[PDB]
């Protein structure tokens, strides 16, 4: 807006990446709605859901905070910026991240409020219950003047997620954020994740994010999220779709899951000058990926059933995006030169198969030997 | 049976022309030795 | 240089540079047989990563 | 003869409708969860240990988002686990919370709060 | 007998000797595993089959036949035996 804040440093090694938004334990924003329920009360069952799951909760997405987390594991530096209360459970989730080696300077306290706690109202309207919020949580009301500008001066990357959108004063908080990082030559990652009333409708949340969809360098987005922001219908016939009489080649007739390679035509409404990279997720099991000059998809895979008992895919979306993040800062080749860019995501690939494998998003988050042993072991040696 | 293993990397040389042309008992064709056949590994 | 490295035990090559040859021109996958060909793609193996070992790791740290 | 092995109860919109209009005395906590999100495995642990500490002096109801999708958003639930603090008293407004909260701090918002 | 067998099968069963355009290596087994197991290939059909598993030396073959390689492509995908009689529509 004005001028520069902070000391000019050499500015340490991997470089900093910054996550905005609220700070929570757990906490899956993208729900929808699932056929396949298990027994309401003997939650031993659930399992079953973890290994047969969803399309959208097959590598679902949480909060900035996971990604921040994951992100320092994968042996990167990470700064999270947002507000918590003055309360007990504040100082948990702070010292949460503390624990995690993640810069906290950019996290403000709200002494006046609780932690992740929203006072609502519940009105009648027409028969039907509702709610309305009366006063929002510290996590959901950081201040334009809170912002910590050395961390926006120092970090390479400016992440967030669609979750800010939910909140009017981080909306206009947001913008102002993204403005200091641009300023200071910070990318910015619009990591989509929508919140359950995002999915109500399609020119509705078109409207909502494009404001901040056209100010991001970087978007990660699922197949569901892609789908329904384009045309899910289509999409959806398109699968269903079977020859009447003979298969268009052999391929066809092995009945495979369906793997769609969306064009870059079809992609061409959501295109805009700044962006650079658009990753759209199967899960772990592809990674399209879309530039200026090229396209593809990285072929991945995954394995629940290797550990039923420990099994859990909560967490896994932070870990592929924070695998992403931790390879564009230190290999910025990878926005020009395709065959790097498609060995480099196989990292993010194999951090996200290691994140189903435990209980927890933080628990399980994997370190970056851990990450790097497993691509190797899974991909042939020419496709390291 | 016993098995001759390469003594070292190299470029194996003989004349296929004194063999003759047999199919194993694995399915592979191969050749059959009746001679003191002179094999050489250039390494 | 060599030959006076390896008369001593001084660590030299196994095989002298200066006499070591290449080993020419070797079958093309169209002169072969089916079985003797290389594989288009490169096949999965569980093998194909080097074993770690103490060894390893103390000539590195020797070699430095 | 065999005592039951769940004290959470599971209510429809409807019947969750009913319970709030109705006259109230206990704080009233409402559990919105759905069986193949895998935090809430580890919530239906806490509010059945929630249940059983505070047997009569509050009430403990679940509500499946696979049931009752349009009433979850109408409530503003913006993902899962999501736990609602109503009080008995109708002026107050109700409490929503979002994440795997400890189970302490549902103790002392039912208790001070409620 | 094998000759009302054969005629039952066509009629009745509807076989028919059609064509099976081989590879090298499946044309190699049908010539070899008639003779043993492991001997000395004998039979010129079976020696000229192990010559063949190499395409280098079908290339060879080839060109002193003075075809090209797309035409000896075509000419395995022959109707082989006999032709039945040529059609007299008046």
């Not at chain 4, 686990?81 to 109503?86: E, G, Q, R």
């Given at each position: 807006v004005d001028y520069d804040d902070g000391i000019d440093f050499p500015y340490d090694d991997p470089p900093l990446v910054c996550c905005f938004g609220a700070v929570q334990?757990?906490?899956?924003?993208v729900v929808r709605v699932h056929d396949n329920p298990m027994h309401?009360?003997?939650?031993?069952?659930?399992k079953m859901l973890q290994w047969d799951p969803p399309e959208f909760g097959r590598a679902p997405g949480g909060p900035p905070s996971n990604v921040a987390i994951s992100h320092v594991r994968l042996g990167g530096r990470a700064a999270f910026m947002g507000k918590v209360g003055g309360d007990d459970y504040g100082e948990e989730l702070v010292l949460m991240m503390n624990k995690e080696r993640?810069?906290?300077?950019?996290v403000k306290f709200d002494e006046g409020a609780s932690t992740a706690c929203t006072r609502v109202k519940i009105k009648f309207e027409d028969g039907k219950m509702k709610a309305e919020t009366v006063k929002e949580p510290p996590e959901d009301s950081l201040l334009a003047?809170?912002?910590n500008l050395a961390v926006l001066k120092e970090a390479r990357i400016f992440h967030f997620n669609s979750?800010?959108?939910?909140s009017p004063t981080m909306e206009s908080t947001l913008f102002k954020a993204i403005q200091w990082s641009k300023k200071f030559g910070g990318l910015i990652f619009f990591?989509?994740?929508?919140?359950?009333?995002?999915?109500?409708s399609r020119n509705e949340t078109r409207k909502l994010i494009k404001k901040s969809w056209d100010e991001a360098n970087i978007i990660e987005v699922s197949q569901q999220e892609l789908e329904f922001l384009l045309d899910e219908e289509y999409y959806e016939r398109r699968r269903n779709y079977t020859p009447q009489?003979?298969?268009?080649?052999?391929?066809?007739?092995?009945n495979r899951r369906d793997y769609y390679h969306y064009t870059p035509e079809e992609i061409k409404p959501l295109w805009?000058?700044?962006?650079k990279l658009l990753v759209v997720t199967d899960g772990t099991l592809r990674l399209h990926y879309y530039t200026p000059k090229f396209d593809g998809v990285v072929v991945g895979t995954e394995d629940v059933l290797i550990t039923p008992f420990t099994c859990?895919?909560?967490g896994s979306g932070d870990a592929v995006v924070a695998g992403i993040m931790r390879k564009l800062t230190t290999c910025p080749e990878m926005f020009e030169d395709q065959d790097v860019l498609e060995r480099q995501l196989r990292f993010a690939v194999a951090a996200g198969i290691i994140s189903q494998?435990?209980?927890g998003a933080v628990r399980g988050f994997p370190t970056e030997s851990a990450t790097q042993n497993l691509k190797e072991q899974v991909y042939v040696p020419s496709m390291w | 049976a016993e098995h001759v293993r390469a003594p070292y990397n190299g470029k194996i040389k003989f004349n296929e022309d004194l063999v003759h042309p047999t199919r194993t008992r694995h399915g592979h064709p191969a050749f059959l030795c009746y001679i003191d056949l002179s094999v050489i590994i250039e390494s | 240089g060599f030959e006076l490295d390896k008369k001593l035990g001084?660590?030299?090559?196994?095989?002298d540079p200066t006499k070591k040859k290449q080993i020419e021109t070797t079958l093309?996958?169209?002169?072969?047989?089916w079985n003797w060909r290389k594989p288009e793609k490169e096949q999965w193996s569980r093998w194909q990563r080097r074993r770690p070992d103490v060894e390893t790791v103390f000539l590195k740290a020797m070699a430095e | 003869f065999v005592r039951e092995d769940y004290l959470v109860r599971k209510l429809s919109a409807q019947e969750l409708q009913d319970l709030v209009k109705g006259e109230r005395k206990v704080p009233l906590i409402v559990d919105f969860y759905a069986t193949?999100?895998?935090?809430c495995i580890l919530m239906a642990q806490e509010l059945e240990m929630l249940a059983v500490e505070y047997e009569s002096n509050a009430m403990i109801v679940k509500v499946d988002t696979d049931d009752e999708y349009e009433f979850a958003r109408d409530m503003?639930?913006?993902?899962?686990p999501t736990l609602f603090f109503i009080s008995p008293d109708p002026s107050k407004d109700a409490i929503r919370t979002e994440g795997l909260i400890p189970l302490q701090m549902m103790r002392d918002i039912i208790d001070n709060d409620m | 007998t094998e000759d009302e067998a054969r005629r039952r099968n066509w009629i009745e069963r509807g076989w028919a000797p059609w064509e099976e355009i081989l590879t090298p290596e499946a044309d190699f087994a049908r010539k070899s595993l008639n003779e043993g197991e492991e001997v000395p290939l004998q039979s010129p059909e079976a020696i000229e089959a192990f010559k063949m598993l190499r395409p280098s030396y079908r290339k060879k073959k080839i060109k002193e036949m003075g075809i090209t390689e797309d035409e000896w492509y075509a000419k395995q995908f022959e109707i082989r035996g006999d032709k039945p009689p040529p059609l007299d529509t008046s």
């Amino acid at each position: 807006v004005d001028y520069d804040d902070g000391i000019d440093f050499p500015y340490d090694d991997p470089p900093l990446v910054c996550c905005f938004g609220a700070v929570q334990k757990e906490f899956v924003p993208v729900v929808r709605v699932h056929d396949n329920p298990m027994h309401p009360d003997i939650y031993s069952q659930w399992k079953m859901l973890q290994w047969d799951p969803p399309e959208f909760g097959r590598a679902p997405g949480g909060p900035p905070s996971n990604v921040a987390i994951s992100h320092v594991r994968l042996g990167g530096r990470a700064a999270f910026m947002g507000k918590v209360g003055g309360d007990d459970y504040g100082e948990e989730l702070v010292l949460m991240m503390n624990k995690e080696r993640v810069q906290t300077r950019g996290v403000k306290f709200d002494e006046g409020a609780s932690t992740a706690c929203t006072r609502v109202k519940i009105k009648f309207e027409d028969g039907k219950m509702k709610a309305e919020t009366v006063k929002e949580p510290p996590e959901d009301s950081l201040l334009a003047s809170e912002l910590n500008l050395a961390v926006l001066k120092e970090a390479r990357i400016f992440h967030f997620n669609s979750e800010v959108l939910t909140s009017p004063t981080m909306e206009s908080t947001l913008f102002k954020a993204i403005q200091w990082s641009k300023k200071f030559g910070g990318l910015i990652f619009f990591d989509l994740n929508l919140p359950l009333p995002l999915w109500r409708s399609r020119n509705e949340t078109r409207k909502l994010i494009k404001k901040s969809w056209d100010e991001a360098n970087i978007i990660e987005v699922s197949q569901q999220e892609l789908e329904f922001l384009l045309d899910e219908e289509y999409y959806e016939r398109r699968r269903n779709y079977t020859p009447q009489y003979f298969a268009e080649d052999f391929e066809q007739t092995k009945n495979r899951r369906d793997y769609y390679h969306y064009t870059p035509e079809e992609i061409k409404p959501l295109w805009h000058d700044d962006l650079k990279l658009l990753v759209v997720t199967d899960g772990t099991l592809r990674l399209h990926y879309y530039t200026p000059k090229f396209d593809g998809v990285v072929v991945g895979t995954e394995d629940v059933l290797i550990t039923p008992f420990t099994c859990d895919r909560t967490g896994s979306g932070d870990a592929v995006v924070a695998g992403i993040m931790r390879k564009l800062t230190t290999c910025p080749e990878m926005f020009e030169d395709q065959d790097v860019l498609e060995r480099q995501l196989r990292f993010a690939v194999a951090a996200g198969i290691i994140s189903q494998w435990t209980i927890g998003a933080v628990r399980g988050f994997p370190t970056e030997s851990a990450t790097q042993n497993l691509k190797e072991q899974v991909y042939v040696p020419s496709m390291w | 049976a016993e098995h001759v293993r390469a003594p070292y990397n190299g470029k194996i040389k003989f004349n296929e022309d004194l063999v003759h042309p047999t199919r194993t008992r694995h399915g592979h064709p191969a050749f059959l030795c009746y001679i003191d056949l002179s094999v050489i590994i250039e390494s | 240089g060599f030959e006076l490295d390896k008369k001593l035990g001084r660590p030299h090559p196994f095989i002298d540079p200066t006499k070591k040859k290449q080993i020419e021109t070797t079958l093309t996958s169209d002169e072969s047989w089916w079985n003797w060909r290389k594989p288009e793609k490169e096949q999965w193996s569980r093998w194909q990563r080097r074993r770690p070992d103490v060894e390893t790791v103390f000539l590195k740290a020797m070699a430095e | 003869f065999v005592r039951e092995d769940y004290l959470v109860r599971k209510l429809s919109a409807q019947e969750l409708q009913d319970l709030v209009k109705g006259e109230r005395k206990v704080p009233l906590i409402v559990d919105f969860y759905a069986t193949w999100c895998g935090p809430c495995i580890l919530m239906a642990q806490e509010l059945e240990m929630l249940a059983v500490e505070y047997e009569s002096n509050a009430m403990i109801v679940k509500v499946d988002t696979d049931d009752e999708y349009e009433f979850a958003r109408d409530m503003q639930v913006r993902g899962l686990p999501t736990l609602f603090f109503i009080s008995p008293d109708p002026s107050k407004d109700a409490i929503r919370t979002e994440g795997l909260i400890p189970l302490q701090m549902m103790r002392d918002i039912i208790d001070n709060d409620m | 007998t094998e000759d009302e067998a054969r005629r039952r099968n066509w009629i009745e069963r509807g076989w028919a000797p059609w064509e099976e355009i081989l590879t090298p290596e499946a044309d190699f087994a049908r010539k070899s595993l008639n003779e043993g197991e492991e001997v000395p290939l004998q039979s010129p059909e079976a020696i000229e089959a192990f010559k063949m598993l190499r395409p280098s030396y079908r290339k060879k073959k080839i060109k002193e036949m003075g075809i090209t390689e797309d035409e000896w492509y075509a000419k395995q995908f022959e109707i082989r035996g006999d032709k039945p009689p040529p059609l007299d529509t008046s």
